Amino acid sequence: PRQHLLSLTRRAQKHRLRELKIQVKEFADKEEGGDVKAVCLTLFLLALRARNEHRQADELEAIMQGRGSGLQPAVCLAIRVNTFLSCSQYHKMYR
DNA sequence: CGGGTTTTTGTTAAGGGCTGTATCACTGTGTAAGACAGGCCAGATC
């Protein structure tokens, strides 16, 4: 009995979308170079802007570009150094 | 109360990559004065 897509587990969702996975990967590496993740997030942003949710698309662009809700290692290194944090104290703080 | 049928859930093997944890040899905080026995000279003395 079918219930819903996101109600399944990871392996079950993979079993259910293996066909679309193969199709998208082949039709993306035929002509579009082969970057599967690129075509994936591009199609997702397009389907999301179809619902004109500018906010969600901007947040996803920020996440996938590293500029919000998550720091690149250089910035947190500068924070760990310029604030005189130790390696164990930063660890506790990060733990 | 089971077949027929369907959607979830493991299961093996080998390799890759990110995350967490044990291990090594060490540290910094326990830090100033007083009690007492022995020697010794200045001096009252009988």
Swiss-Prot record:
DNA-binding feature ranges: 1-65
Stated consequence of mutating R16A: Impairs DNA-binding and reduces hairpin formation without affecting nicking activity
Disruption phenotype: Mice display a severe combined immunodeficiency phenotype. The have a small lymphoid organs that do not contain mature B and T-lymphocytes. The arrest of B- and T-cell differentiation occurs at an early stage and correlates with the inability to perform V(D)J recombination. The frequency of homologous immunoglobulin pairing is much lower. No obvious neuroanatomical or behavioral abnormalities have been observed.
Localization terms from the record: Nucleus
Effect recorded for H15A: Allows robust hairpin activity
Tissue specificity comment: Maturing lymphoid cells and central nervous system.
Processing and modification events after translation: Autoubiquitinated in the presence of CDC34/UBCH3.
Coiled coil location: none
Outcome following mutation: K14A: Reduced hairpin activity
Family of the protein in this entry: Belongs to the RAG1 family.
Domain remarks: The RING-type zinc finger mediates the E3 ubiquitin-protein ligase activity. The NBD (nonamer binding) DNA-binding domain mediates the specific binding to the nonamer RSS motif by forming a tightly interwoven homodimer that binds and synapses 2 nonamer elements, with each NBD making contact with both DNA molecules. Each RSS is composed of well-conserved heptamer (consensus 5'-CACAGTG-3') and nonamer (consensus 5'-ACAAAAACC-3') sequences separated by a spacer of either 12 bp or 23 bp.
Protein's job: Catalytic component of the RAG complex, a multiprotein complex that mediates the DNA cleavage phase during V(D)J recombination. V(D)J recombination assembles a diverse repertoire of immunoglobulin and T-cell receptor genes in developing B and T-lymphocytes through rearrangement of different V (variable), in some cases D (diversity), and J (joining) gene segments. In the RAG complex, RAG1 mediates the DNA-binding to the conserved recombination signal sequences (RSS) and catalyzes the DNA cleavage activities by introducing a double-strand break between the RSS and the adjacent coding segment.
Subunit structure: Homodimer. Component of the RAG complex composed of core components RAG1 and RAG2, and associated component HMGB1 or HMGB2. Interacts with DCAF1, leading to recruitment of the CUL4A-RBX1-DDB1-DCAF1/VPRBP complex to ubiquitinate proteins and limit error-prone repair during V(D)J recombination.
Protein name from the UniProt record: V(D)J recombination-activating protein 1
Originating species: Mus musculus
Gene that produces this protein: Rag1
Segment of the intact protein contained: 392 to 486 of 1040
